[PDB]
Amino acid sequence: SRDRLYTWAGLWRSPSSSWEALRLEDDQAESQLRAPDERSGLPYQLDYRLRWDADWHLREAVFHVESETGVRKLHLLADGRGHWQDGDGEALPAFDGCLDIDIWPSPFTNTFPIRRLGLADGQRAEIRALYIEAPALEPRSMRQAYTRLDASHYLYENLEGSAFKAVLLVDEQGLVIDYPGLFQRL
Amino acid sequence: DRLYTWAGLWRSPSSSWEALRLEDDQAESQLRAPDERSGLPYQLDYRLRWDADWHLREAVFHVESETGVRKLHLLADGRGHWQDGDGEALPAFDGCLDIDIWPSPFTNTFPIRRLGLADGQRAEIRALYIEAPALEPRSMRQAYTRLDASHYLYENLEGSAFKAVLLVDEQGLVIDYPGLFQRL
């Protein structure tokens, strides 16, 4: 009654991408990510917080996305041993075996397998990642591989059929500097 | 606590999304859009307040982008005399009665509601044009023509010759800005 909402979408288009600002503590991160919906062409903002254990196993994830379609939330709990549940404590068996989350579009999440696995040069690991693509935030299990090439370079590969592969340049804490052609640290 | 910022290198076509809350004498809006040079997103929050004649009296802007936070606070007397939030006079904007914000069709409402044009009637205005994300205002010559109650011809008078026909609702709020904005 006090006010009335009016919403406008632009019809003009310009090329655009993501911008993410993250704050990192020892056992948790909080981030604000802004990016275009790649189907609709309209912007969204994703706010999220991740919390992990001493061994860099994910224990909690909270997401809040705002877009033209409305506000969507997601709350996930993980036991650090591959068992997931929602914020209501309902088990999510479809994610069994996932130890790490991978959020698109964010190169933050590549840090988890790096820090968790502690790979040596030349060592390869195949993982089951819980892949969550903004803005829809509908998680699904995804097979991935990481190979340590040297201290600052990791070979990332999709294992589900795309054959996508990339070499990540990371810093001494395992944070991505360059995700070549996809993300740059500012 | 360590701060980390990443820019995307991938590109996808994008545009503005604006959600505005309107009251009798003021509006507060949240506008998200891409920077048209950098490819990176920004968010503009703004609030406008006007008198009963639809003359702008105050405007406050807050933009967040990869370049940082930028703020702008304008005061107008409704008679074409402007000041910043600290009271310092802004002679460069002398004679402006209306603000025009890009990218927003909201601000087309001001001349429509203020001018009281008859059907077929054209008026030139001096608009204070404020383009996000930089928010560096400048006076600009524009013209409005009432075609009928629900259609106004907009003209840029600075030399582009850009013209548009705006479809508006019963309160002068833009429904269609053809090829630029659509009401959802």
Residue numbers in the entry:
A (entry chain A): 2 to 187
B (entry chain B): 4 to 187
Quoted passage from the original study:
The crystal structure of PA1994 from Pseudomonas aeruginosa, a member of the Pfam PF06475 family classified as a domain of unknown function (DUF1089), reveals a novel fold comprising a 15-stranded β-sheet wrapped around a single α-helix that assembles into a tight dimeric arrangement. The remote structural similarity to lipoprotein localization factors, in addition to the presence of an acidic pocket that is conserved in DUF1089 homologs, phospholipid-binding and sugar-binding proteins, indicate a role for PA1994 and the DUF1089 family in glycolipid metabolism. Genome-context analysis lends further support to the involvement of this family of proteins in glycolipid metabolism and indicates possible activation of DUF1089 homologs under conditions of bacterial cell-wall stress or host–pathogen interactions. The PA1994 gene of Pseudomonas aeruginosa, an opportunistic human pathogen, encodes a protein with a molecular weight of 21.6 kDa (residues 1–187) and a calculated isoelectric point of 4.9.
The final model includes 370 residues (residues 2–187 of chain A and residues 4–187 of chain B), nine ethylene glycol molecules, two MPD molecules and 367 water molecules in the asymmetric unit. PA1994 can be viewed as consisting of two subdomains: the first half of the β-sheet (β1′, β3–β8) and helix H1 (residues 1–98) compose the first domain, which packs against the other subdomain consisting of the second half of the β-sheet (β9–β15) and helix H2 (residues 99–187). An analysis of PA1994 using the CastP server revealed a deep pocket (15 × 6 × 7 Å) enclosed mainly by helix H2 and strand β7, with additional contributions made by strands β10–β12 and the loop between strands β14 and β15. The entrance to the pocket in PA1994 forms a long and narrow groove (20 × 7 Å) composed of strictly or highly conserved hydrophobic residues (Ile102, Pro106, Pro108, Phe165, Leu170 and Ile178) and also involves the dimerization interface (Trp13), suggesting a hydrophobic component of the ligand and the likely requirement of dimerization for binding. Analytical size-exclusion chromatography in combination with static light scattering indicates that PA1994 is a dimer in solution. The swapped β-strands appear to participate in stabilizing the conserved cavity.
